[PDB]
Write an enzyme that holds these catalytic residues in place. Sequence first.
Site, short mmCIF file in Angstrom:
data_model
loop_
_atom_site.label_atom_id
_atom_site.label_comp_id
_atom_site.label_asym_id
_atom_site.label_seq_id
_atom_site.Cartn_x
_atom_site.Cartn_y
_atom_site.Cartn_z
N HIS A 45 -6.85 -2.91 -10.33
CA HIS A 45 -5.75 -3.25 -11.23
C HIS A 45 -6.20 -4.25 -12.29
O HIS A 45 -6.44 -5.42 -11.99
CB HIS A 45 -4.60 -3.85 -10.43
CG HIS A 45 -3.66 -2.83 -9.88
ND1 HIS A 45 -3.88 -2.23 -8.66
CD2 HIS A 45 -2.50 -2.33 -10.35
CE1 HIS A 45 -2.89 -1.39 -8.41
NE2 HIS A 45 -2.04 -1.43 -9.42
N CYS B 215 2.22 -1.85 -9.74
CA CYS B 215 2.05 -1.08 -10.96
C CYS B 215 1.19 0.15 -10.71
O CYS B 215 0.16 0.07 -10.04
CB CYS B 215 1.41 -1.95 -12.04
SG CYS B 215 1.10 -1.06 -13.60
N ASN C 117 -14.09 -5.09 -8.82
CA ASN C 117 -12.66 -5.24 -8.65
C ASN C 117 -12.29 -6.69 -8.34
O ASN C 117 -11.55 -7.34 -9.10
CB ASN C 117 -12.24 -4.28 -7.52
CG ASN C 117 -10.75 -4.22 -7.29
OD1 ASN C 117 -10.02 -5.19 -7.51
ND2 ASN C 117 -10.28 -3.08 -6.78
N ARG D 287 0.86 -1.18 0.00
CA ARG D 287 0.00 0.00 0.00
C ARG D 287 0.89 1.23 0.00
O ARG D 287 1.86 1.29 0.78
CB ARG D 287 -0.93 0.09 1.24
CG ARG D 287 -1.84 -1.11 1.53
CD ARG D 287 -2.88 -1.35 0.44
NE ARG D 287 -3.66 -0.16 0.12
CZ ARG D 287 -4.35 0.01 -1.00
NH1 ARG D 287 -4.46 -0.95 -1.90
NH2 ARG D 287 -4.95 1.18 -1.22
MN LIG Z 1 -8.12 -6.01 -8.05
ZN LIG Z 2 0.29 -2.94 -14.70
#
Ligand SMILES: [Mn+2]
Ligand SMILES: [Zn+2]
EC number: 3.1.-.-
Lengths: 162, 162
Positions: B97, B104, B118, B60
């Site tokens: 993500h 990333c 998510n 985090r």
């Molecule tokens: Mn995720």
């Molecule tokens: Zn990425």
Amino acid sequence: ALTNAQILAVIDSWEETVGQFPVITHHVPLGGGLQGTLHCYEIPLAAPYGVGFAKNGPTRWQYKRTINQVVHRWGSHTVPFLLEPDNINGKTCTASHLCHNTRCHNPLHLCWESLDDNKGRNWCPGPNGGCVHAVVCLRQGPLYGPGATVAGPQQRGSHFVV
Amino acid sequence: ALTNAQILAVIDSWEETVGQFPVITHHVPLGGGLQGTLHCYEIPLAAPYGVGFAKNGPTRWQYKRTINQVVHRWGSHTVPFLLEPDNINGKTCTASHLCHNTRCHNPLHLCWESLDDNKGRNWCPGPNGGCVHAVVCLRQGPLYGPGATVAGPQQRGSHFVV
DNA sequence: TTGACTCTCTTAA
DNA sequence: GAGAGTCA
DNA sequence: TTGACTCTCTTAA
DNA sequence: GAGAGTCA
Ligand SMILES: [Mn+2]
Ligand SMILES: [Zn+2]
Ligand SMILES: [Mn+2]
Ligand SMILES: [Zn+2]
Ligand SMILES: [Zn+2]
Ligand SMILES: [Zn+2]
């Protein structure tokens, strides 16, 4: 510790009590635009729940039996699996609702698998929509679909490539 | 900060800093037996991370800027979406993500959606395997597959039906 | 031995 | 997947 | 003002 | 998705 016979007796008492729970007929998406029917055996919303049962959280219950003066207690959906391995691939096995109906205690609606496998069934397209679970889903997951994404990938400048 | 101009400046400074993170190529399953290539812009493993960035948990980070002599701080992946609604259908919007790579910070790999949407991408078959996400997945989810279920639905007696 | 409550904990986004 | 405080 | 740490919290299985 | 305590 409890013998195999004693564990079988616990499973039998649990099935006998849960079998008397109200049986609710639910029409459910199977995937592929098809609809099916599941019959859930639903624990009551408030006490009394049934012999041996007590609520430990808003949608959590436990089953309790006293054997040879020793109190034994289990998560209420874990009882069908007391003779099964309790971990796999280093992950704890969990009771997993194929009907996605927490109050249901129908053992024909439960499987025994990692928490990740359990969660993932929420998004499965279902047994007629492309389910690849080896222990097949009984229905399309309640969260299957296009989603409601608010904003997609984007940049203001030119610093990034995908 | 309050002003659209101040928010755009925050986004622009964030993109410029993240644009200098190392670009790491990852080859990924797309579903359908196909493979693709993603370019992740990965925050360093240890301090210093980049101007404005600090680690608050093992994976985090937070971005911080001083505006009008006041410190403003955001979750490090939320900055691209500072002009977007922060909820949807009464559910909090989260940075999500598409590359399933927490380090990333490539905004071309991020979307802004409910925690349920998510999570569900972890099990998606992917853009060449049947993804139905309206904001399309960049890869098959890492948890897609048959699972490792230990025990399926079963009963000892004759009290239950599916 | 039993019921009906109480409390806190796990996981990985 | 998040927010916020303590130090230097 | 900026950096590098600390802690606990949310959600829904 | 879990385990365990208290009281009568
Ligand atoms: Mn995720
Ligand atoms: Zn990425
Ligand atoms: Mn489940
Ligand atoms: Zn059911
Ligand atoms: Zn399935
Ligand atoms: Zn998808």
